[PDB]
Amino acid sequence: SQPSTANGGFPSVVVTAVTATTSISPDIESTWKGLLAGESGIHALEDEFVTKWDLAVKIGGHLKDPVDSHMGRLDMRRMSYVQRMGKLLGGQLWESAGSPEVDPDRFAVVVGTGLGGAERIVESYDLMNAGGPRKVSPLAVQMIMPNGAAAVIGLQLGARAGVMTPVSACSSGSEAIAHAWRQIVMGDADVAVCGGVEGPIEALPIAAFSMMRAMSTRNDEPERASRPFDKDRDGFVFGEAGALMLIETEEHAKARGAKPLARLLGAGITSDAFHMVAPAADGVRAGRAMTRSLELAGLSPADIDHVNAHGTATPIGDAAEANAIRVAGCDQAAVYAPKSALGHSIGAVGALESVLTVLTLRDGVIPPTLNYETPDPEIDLDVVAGEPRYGDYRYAVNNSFGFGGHNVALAFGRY
Amino acid sequence: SQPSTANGGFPSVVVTAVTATTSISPDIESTWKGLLAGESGIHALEDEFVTKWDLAVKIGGHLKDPVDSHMGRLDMRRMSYVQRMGKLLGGQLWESAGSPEVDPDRFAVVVGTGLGGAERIVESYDLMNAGGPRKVSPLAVQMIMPNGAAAVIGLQLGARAGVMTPVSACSSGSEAIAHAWRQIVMGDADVAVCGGVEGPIEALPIAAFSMMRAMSTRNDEPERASRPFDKDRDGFVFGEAGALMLIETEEHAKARGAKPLARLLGAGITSDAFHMVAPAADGVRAGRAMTRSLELAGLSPADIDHVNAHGTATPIGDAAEANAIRVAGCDQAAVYAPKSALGHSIGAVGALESVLTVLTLRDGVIPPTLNYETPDPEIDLDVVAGEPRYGDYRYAVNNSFGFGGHNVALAFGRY
Ligand SMILES: C=C/C(C)=C\[C@@]1(C)SC(=O)C(C)=C1O
Ligand SMILES: C=C/C(C)=C\[C@@]1(C)SC(=O)C(C)=C1O
Ligand code: NA
Ligand code: NA
């Protein structure tokens, strides 16, 4: 037979700490309580760029606690935004894990980024246009290189078993967790910090996705705009986030007295090869990513109690994912779409949702999918709504799909 | 025991086709003949930005055959540069492989990019500053997303078993081949297109690396400037490239009548966690990447006949790598530093050098390291020089290290 987590072919891998900053709270346990209480992080945008351009979209979720409120002058001048978010989250996670002293040579970092947080290249041109080539900083390269956020975290925490940055648009944060899991089960590492970071809401990304008709313009009722799987959905809403988790073999956790929050059992990565931005309507390759996570985990579809949907609230996106969940045989699972409350954070969002999937398993509860008022016949899923659903969730799949047709599914189990 | 290629724990993986565009030729076999003849791709830069800024560096290797000489109006307007290079190379590789019809569901793409080729973000701002948010294109997102080049190639060739983009600066093209190998040996794919692409030589990258004292300024004798491992080296020279290879299981190659060019036996990925730009002087983690490739391959250091060095010609870089090669027990291997002739192409260069390592094994010959005239006591390596060395090369390691401390070693064997 082929190796699986269930059959002992791969070592057992557990999640031992989590951290996230969101539009609801800088504290992940407070985000979680807020989600359960039906809170939304989506408000009217007060940024002057909205009025300057009279943007069609006037809603979104900025971080409750801005990263830079924690950043001094040196960091503001010598790191990109996503590097600063990485430093902040990396330090928070390590403290939450009990500041353990690990073997650097068995410790990896895998952190995805999304669509930019891309400010530092332009600033270098400007320096040079005015002052000449000797006015670019000898610090420019480390601030501009797209591996920069993972590099900062690796250097901060002392990771010598690989520092990787996968890029797959909206799935980058989940894909990072996937590669971290691989690095451990293949024997290259015993412990990994993994997840995703992303820049803040800015005018150009809004314009670019708005022009594709991908975004909600329900500006009158910001908290009601994001409606994944609802009949009356009209696109996604941006909500800022960054999220990291600590994963390690069960024996490594045991040896240092860390209590696991959940198990990371398997990961599946596939691709649509269909269209540069739109998902394949049939959901077949996305479904297969789910199936692959189950194969590696040693689970059957019948074992899956819960799916944390990618669920962006676009008309075609949600329809494609409903088909995918059917293809994977998981359409009896209880479904949550967190973007209903937290919005879409592109490179970070899969990581944030992996953390939420962990908390769902730990606590035996799924928050309500906000704004889910009218089921859609083409969807036909069991979507949690109204109030939290307490349940015996034993296994879950977190989905994260990205523009380009990148499909990542992570299988988690209760510990 | 742990699985290895030698012990049958991993399936046999072979390289069945190669393509590259370089400063010497658009045809990889002509590049190779040129290298053997002692040709350099490095010349005086004629770009007006050199004189505009009176840049300290006035040398480099532009592609012999520019990508865009093959590109029509639609591609020029609707793809980024690295996407156009990807499309070009992807089509060339597929034709070289005999245009095979493969199962899309077992076919992956992994393509790295480096430090930018970053033109398309600025062009979107400009459209919006003048014409407003409705003047950004609905095509902006697909041209700007950093997964774009791998996405184009995946869509072009029909890869449905994953489309991935690793970013690790100068090691990204080798790291791509590493992840492709993993995707196959873990059973997610049977065939993969893999490698790296990079943008052309531009003013800002030259200014940024020049200000770090990383670059040669021997402008009087462009072909003599790049001197890896030489006593009188004074930094790297940029030389443009893109390179892709086709890898597949040996049984998949056999079934379709493809003749392998070499075997890809193992890959090691580690990190220095030392400094944001400089390598660790001791070479220990870089050495360990080499050792890890050997472990996975099932080889000992004594088996390694040849090392295709990262060899950038910086004072501290070459010194660190000599230490790494010692740490890995590989200091009796015949060493080639191709950057001596082809210069440094950042995200693409590891892929190009993996192709060269394949040709060295196929043909039993290593080209001369150009400009190697005075051995350096701190290096103490067996560097091939003067004229090509014909030899019985059975196994080789290609090294590629990247700013951030990212170390990738790939182990190849003669077929
Ligand atoms: C493969 C998925 C593709 C191409 C597009 C998706 C579904 S992913 C995403 O985050 C959004 C907003 C979409 O519309
Ligand atoms: C880990 C390697 C680091 C940090 C720097 C290196 C050696 S990698 C590279 O391409 C160049 C020019 C360097 O100087
Ligand atoms: Na999800
Ligand atoms: Na090399």
Side-chain angles (χ1 to χ4, degrees):
Chain A
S1 54
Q2 295 299 334
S4 75
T5 298
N7 81 16
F10 302 126
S12 168
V13 176
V14 288
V15 183
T16 52
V18 300
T19 196
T21 189
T22 77
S23 57
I24 291 179
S25 181
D27 297 300
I28 183 58
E29 298 288 344
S30 300
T31 289
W32 185 235
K33 295 180 188 147
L35 291 175
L36 297 166
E39 293 163 18
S40 169
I42 308 307
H43 313 301
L45 291 177
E46 317 219 316
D47 308 72
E48 206 74 1
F49 64 68
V50 173
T51 52
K52 191 191 181 176
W53 296 119
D54 193 24
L55 293 179
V57 171
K58 306 191 162 63
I59 56 170
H62 290 293
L63 295 181
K64 181 67 180 177
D65 181 28
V67 165
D68 289 343
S69 78
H70 301 262
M71 292 289 142
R73 186 177 176 76
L74 288 175
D75 289 345
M76 289 300 302
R77 287 212 281 101
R78 306 189 182 175
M79 255 184 247
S80 69
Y81 178 90
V82 297
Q83 280 175 326
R84 298 189 305 268
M85 180 180 276
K87 176 180 177 167
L88 180 56
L89 298 179
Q92 291 177 177
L93 184 73
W94 209 249
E95 181 168 322
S96 284
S99 296
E101 288 176 355
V102 301
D103 185 350
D105 295 345
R106 305 298 296 154
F107 174 31
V109 166
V110 191
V111 176
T113 58
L115 265 263
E119 75 282 357
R120 290 291 180 162
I121 31 270
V122 193
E123 172 207 310
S124 285
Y125 293 102
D126 287 344
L127 258 15
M128 184 166 55
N129 291 123
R134 296 201 70 87
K135 245 64 201 165
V136 175
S137 172
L139 307 183
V141 168
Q142 68 193 71
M143 292 191 283
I144 291 173
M145 67 196 188
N147 48 313
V152 162
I153 296 167
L155 189 53
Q156 167 193 227
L157 302 178
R160 295 189 176 112
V163 173
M164 305 186 280
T165 300
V167 299
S168 54
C170 318
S171 52
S172 300
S174 283
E175 200 188 328
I177 299 169
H179 287 298
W181 177 80
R182 292 178 182 199
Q183 186 83 343
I184 299 180
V185 302
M186 290 193 79
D188 289 75
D190 296 333
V191 56
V193 165
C194 55
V197 296
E198 179 62 88
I201 291 163
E202 300 282 9
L204 171 54
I206 290 171
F209 285 104
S210 281
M211 268 311 296
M212 302 174 55
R213 220 180 79 171
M215 299 188 73
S216 175
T217 58
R218 201 193 293 265
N219 295 325
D220 44 292
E221 294 181 295
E223 297 90 349
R224 298 191 71 207
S226 184
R227 315 176 69 88
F229 303 115
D230 188 73
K231 191 183 175 280
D232 298 326
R233 66 192 185 275
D234 78 322
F236 77 80
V237 179
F238 276 131
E240 295 171 10
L244 299 178
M245 60 171 58
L246 182 64
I247 67 174
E248 62 200 280
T249 64
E250 191 171 347
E251 217 56 56
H252 189 278
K254 209 104 75 164
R256 76 180 181 85
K259 182 170 75 183
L261 306 165
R263 301 171 185 286
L264 175 53
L265 301 177
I269 300 168
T270 68
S271 49
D272 284 356
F274 167 71
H275 190 281
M276 292 296 292
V277 295
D282 65 18
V284 170
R285 295 311 300 157
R288 166 74 200 167
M290 301 180 76
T291 304
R292 184 51 174 170
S293 75
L294 301 190
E295 292 176 358
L296 292 172
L299 305 167
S300 68
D303 298 332
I304 300 309
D305 301 313
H306 171 53
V307 170
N308 184 302
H310 184 57
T312 63
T314 66
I316 79 176
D318 296 355
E321 182 168 19
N323 280 338
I325 290 165
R326 279 185 280 281
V327 166
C330 289
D331 82 346
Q332 305 304 309
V335 177
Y336 178 42
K339 294 181 186 59
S340 65
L342 289 162
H344 198 348
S345 51
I346 306 288
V349 81
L352 173 56
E353 298 177 356
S354 299
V355 170
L356 300 180
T357 300
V358 166
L359 302 177
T360 289
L361 288 163
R362 189 194 67 189
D363 289 349
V365 63
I366 300 165
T369 305
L370 300 192
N371 310 305
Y372 188 70
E373 289 162 19
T374 313
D376 183 333
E378 301 295 299
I379 301 299
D380 201 25
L381 299 174
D382 179 17
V383 178
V384 172
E387 65 179 15
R389 188 190 297 182
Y390 295 83
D392 188 27
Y393 313 118
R394 308 159 298 167
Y395 302 104
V397 178
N398 178 39
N399 292 346
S400 194
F401 311 140
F403 307 107
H406 307 286
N407 308 309
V408 182
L410 301 169
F412 287 91
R414 186 187 176 193
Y415 176 78
Chain B
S1 54
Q2 295 299 334
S4 75
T5 298
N7 81 16
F10 302 126
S12 168
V13 176
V14 288
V15 183
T16 52
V18 300
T19 196
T21 189
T22 77
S23 57
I24 291 179
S25 181
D27 297 300
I28 183 58
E29 298 288 344
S30 300
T31 289
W32 185 235
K33 295 180 188 147
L35 291 175
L36 297 166
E39 293 163 18
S40 169
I42 308 307
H43 313 301
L45 291 177
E46 317 219 316
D47 308 72
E48 206 74 1
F49 64 68
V50 173
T51 52
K52 191 191 181 176
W53 296 119
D54 193 24
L55 293 179
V57 171
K58 306 191 162 63
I59 56 170
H62 290 293
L63 295 181
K64 181 67 180 177
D65 181 28
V67 165
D68 289 343
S69 78
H70 301 262
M71 292 289 142
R73 186 177 176 76
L74 288 175
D75 289 345
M76 289 300 302
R77 287 212 281 101
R78 306 189 182 175
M79 255 184 247
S80 69
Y81 178 90
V82 297
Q83 280 175 326
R84 298 189 305 268
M85 180 180 276
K87 176 180 177 167
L88 180 56
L89 298 179
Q92 291 177 177
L93 184 73
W94 209 249
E95 181 168 322
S96 284
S99 296
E101 288 176 355
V102 301
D103 185 350
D105 295 345
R106 305 298 296 154
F107 174 31
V109 166
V110 191
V111 176
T113 58
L115 265 263
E119 75 282 357
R120 290 291 180 162
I121 31 270
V122 193
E123 172 207 310
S124 285
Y125 293 102
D126 287 344
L127 258 15
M128 184 166 55
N129 291 123
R134 296 201 70 87
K135 245 64 201 165
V136 175
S137 172
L139 307 183
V141 168
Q142 68 193 71
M143 292 191 283
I144 291 173
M145 67 196 188
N147 48 313
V152 162
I153 296 167
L155 189 53
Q156 167 193 227
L157 302 178
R160 295 189 176 112
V163 173
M164 305 186 280
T165 300
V167 299
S168 54
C170 318
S171 52
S172 300
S174 283
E175 200 188 328
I177 299 169
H179 287 298
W181 177 80
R182 292 178 182 199
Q183 186 83 343
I184 299 180
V185 302
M186 290 193 79
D188 289 75
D190 296 333
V191 56
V193 165
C194 55
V197 296
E198 179 62 88
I201 291 163
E202 300 282 9
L204 171 54
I206 290 171
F209 285 104
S210 281
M211 268 311 296
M212 302 174 55
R213 220 180 79 171
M215 299 188 73
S216 175
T217 58
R218 201 193 293 265
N219 295 325
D220 44 292
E221 294 181 295
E223 297 90 349
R224 298 191 71 207
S226 184
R227 315 176 69 88
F229 303 115
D230 188 73
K231 191 183 175 280
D232 298 326
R233 66 192 185 275
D234 78 322
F236 77 80
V237 179
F238 276 131
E240 295 171 10
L244 299 178
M245 60 171 58
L246 182 64
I247 67 174
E248 62 200 280
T249 64
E250 191 171 347
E251 217 56 56
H252 189 278
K254 209 104 75 164
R256 76 180 181 85
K259 182 170 75 183
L261 306 165
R263 301 171 185 286
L264 175 53
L265 301 177
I269 300 168
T270 68
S271 49
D272 284 356
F274 167 71
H275 190 281
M276 292 296 292
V277 295
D282 65 18
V284 170
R285 295 311 300 157
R288 166 74 200 167
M290 301 180 76
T291 304
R292 184 51 174 170
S293 75
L294 301 190
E295 292 176 358
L296 292 172
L299 305 167
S300 68
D303 298 332
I304 300 309
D305 301 313
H306 171 53
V307 170
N308 184 302
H310 184 57
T312 63
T314 66
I316 79 176
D318 296 355
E321 182 168 19
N323 280 338
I325 290 165
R326 279 185 280 281
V327 166
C330 289
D331 82 346
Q332 305 304 309
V335 177
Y336 178 42
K339 294 181 186 59
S340 65
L342 289 162
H344 198 348
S345 51
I346 306 288
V349 81
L352 173 56
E353 298 177 356
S354 299
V355 170
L356 300 180
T357 300
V358 166
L359 302 177
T360 289
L361 288 163
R362 189 194 67 189
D363 289 349
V365 63
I366 300 165
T369 305
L370 300 192
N371 310 305
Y372 188 70
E373 289 162 19
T374 313
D376 183 333
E378 301 295 299
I379 301 299
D380 201 25
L381 299 174
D382 179 17
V383 178
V384 172
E387 65 179 15
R389 188 190 297 182
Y390 295 83
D392 188 27
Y393 313 118
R394 308 159 298 167
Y395 302 104
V397 178
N398 178 39
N399 292 346
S400 194
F401 311 140
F403 307 107
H406 307 286
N407 308 309
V408 182
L410 301 169
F412 287 91
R414 186 187 176 193
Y415 176 78

